Symmetry: C2
């Protein structure tokens, strides 16, 4: 039976329809237009400016007009709060709790919830599920979730952690290649937007680099990551609350330090080409690697070891310099990399870049959003 997967983006809405792990139909929204891929042909259609639930509606309509029967719809919801400990098939109780999670991620959740609501209304005979990014980290203990602050603030700002579906998908895909049930894995979700690391013991999250918010942890494209806590306070005394929030989230990270780009590839280019901003670009790369390595080290001690270091996402799977720099700093722990394989790998498949003799293995593992949402559908429905 057919599965429809929605992928909500900043300025777009993509979909893909699956039948037995095979793509039937696909396309995306945003002069704005919707593009469709069906029966081997490409249909582009001019549109006026749409919001997300309008785009979703139009996609459903196109599917109905072509008799693409749909039995399942999968959705991604970033921040499921304290309620959602696992992903869920969508009912009235789930819808209620989801709506209470809206203020948790005002940038992500609302447009995601909008698509869900319109999808439930336009496809009332289909079973629908929501894949929740924070759920995988429900195995993290109190002590690892707790910041050293007094009540009531202590319970208000517990750590949540994110990219949970990505981590869960990657772990699941490594089950034939390694023995996850007896393993210590550190996964690095290095993407555009958010980046994080996760310490995984026997297939389960033990700790992660993000916190109560998606600002915490690693240096990111435009986000500061972990910094001295008095700094946000001092900056507020200069420019106020909302401006500080904007700077730390949209004008920091690789962008703020390189003074060139939020894209690591542009940063690497400027360094290796020399280059009018190399200086700042070199600093941005060093600071990024430092924080990443520091994060890896901290997590390794928490989980009591390391068998496999995994890179995933866009940066993790397409930038060999990051993986090389990181493995060099972790060489003393027993990481012997194969540089021929590393420099050519773009992570289109699960590929080890480590010599088989190396004490700690290093691998790359794809985490395509659509396959990730679909995979959760399997777990919930068995299809």
């Amino acid at each position: 039976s057919n599965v429809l997967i929605f992928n909500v983006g900043s300025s777009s809405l993509t979909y893909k329809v699956f039948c037995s792990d095979n793509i039937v139909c696909s396309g995306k929204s945003n002069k704005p237009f919707i593009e469709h891929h069906l029966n081997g042909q490409i249909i582009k259609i001019e549109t006026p400016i749409l919001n997300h639930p309008q785009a979703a509606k139009l996609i459903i309509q196109f599917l109905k007009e072509n008799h693409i029967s749909i039995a399942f719809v999968g959705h991604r919801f970033v921040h499921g709060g304290s309620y959602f400990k696992k992903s869920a098939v969508i009912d009235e109780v789930v819808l209620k709790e989801l709506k209470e999670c809206l203020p948790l991620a005002p940038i992500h959740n609302p447009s995601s919830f909008g698509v869900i609501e319109i999808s439930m209304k336009e496809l009332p005979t289909t079973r629908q599920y929501v894949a929740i990014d924070t759920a995988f980290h429900s195995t993290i203990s109190q002590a690892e979730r707790t910041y050293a602050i007094p009540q009531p603030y202590q319970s208000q700002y517990l750590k949540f952690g994110f990219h949970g579906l990505s981590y869960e998908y990657v772990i699941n895909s490594l089950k034939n290649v390694i023995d996850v049930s007896h393993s210590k894995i550190i996964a690095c979700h290095l993407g555009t937007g958010g980046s994080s690391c996760c310490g995984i013991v026997n297939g389960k999250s033990f700790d992660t680099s993000m916190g109560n918010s998606t600002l915490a942890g690693l240096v990111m494209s435009t986000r500061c990551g972990d910094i001295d806590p008095t700094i946000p306070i001092d900056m507020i005394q200069q420019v106020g609350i909302e401006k500080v929030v904007d700077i730390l989230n949209k004008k920091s990270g690789l962008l703020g330090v390189s003074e060139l780009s939020s894209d690591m590839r542009d940063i690497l280019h400027e360094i290796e080409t020399r280059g009018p901003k190399a200086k700042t670009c070199q600093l941005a790369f060093d600071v990024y690697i430092k924080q990443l390595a520091k994060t890896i080290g901290g997590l390794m001690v928490e989980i009591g070891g390391l068998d496999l270091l995994v890179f995933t996402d866009q940066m993790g799977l397409e930038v060999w310099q990051v993986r090389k720099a990181i493995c060099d700093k972790m060489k003393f722990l027993g990481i012997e990399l194969d540089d021929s394989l590393n420099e050519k790998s773009m992570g289109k498949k699960i590929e080890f870049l480590t010599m088989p003799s190396s004490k700690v293995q290093v691998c790359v593992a794809p985490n395509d959003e659509e396959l990730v949402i679909l995979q959760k559908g399997k777990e919930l429905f068995q299809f």
Copy 2:
């Protein structure tokens, strides 16, 4: 040659005089006897016994003057005066002999630490005046970390904030004292050392490569890093921002500095020993004290792990200051987290060590070595003086 060391405290000023690594005179201002039908006084300990001079309540420079006067009247001649300055800012990459330039630069560092810097400054100014033919030096707590490179001092934020909020690091004098004391015991110049200053007030870790600070736990402020007695340490940067919205700026600063850390989580005490005691006696606050210990250990372990990767390995882990020297449960908790890295702890030595002297707690076969190293406040300032004047 005698050396006068001033230790500026909160309610009083204390001092010691050294002659060849030994104390010949010492004292505390503003002393009170609860049964002594009497006034506040300076208590002097000199050779034989106790000398009490009744005084009004004294500030620090007033006490300093009267202390100097007492030593003159009792024929203790002074060749050097040592002082301690908490935050030297950008200018002080080294501790310094005090001249006109140094005094001018120290003056500009006052807003860095409104409480501690002016107190130590006032004592320095009066000390230069009452002993103007005496060489004096200021030991700067931030100077040891001048060797930390830009990438390690830099937070991933844009200009101009990036340069306004560079990392400094503290407990520098404690670290370089411990490192120096280790030169009689290990090859420091070819060593990777992580030191843990586990104090009653602030706490930090330092990654040390060949005798020099590579990176450290505190940042621009003395709030960053480890979970501390009353401080939060490193937390989600969004948390202070959201707390401002609830209770305002100044209240948040007070909460994170004075009502967090061990005190805030345990809901019992700021002292680790009381926390351990409550756990083991199963007091009414055992659950929260157990949580406070777990959170504290977790952050310390994570900090050590991060520093190890930064410096490229680990040969020697060293504990110092009050909690590091006199609380074996903390050391055990840490070493068990790191057993996988090659730490074989002699549990009998650890349970009996109070860190009165440098002694290894690990087996000599153990890949990574663990030791406790004393860092008495006065010897630390005195040692900086030996380095500057060769006394």
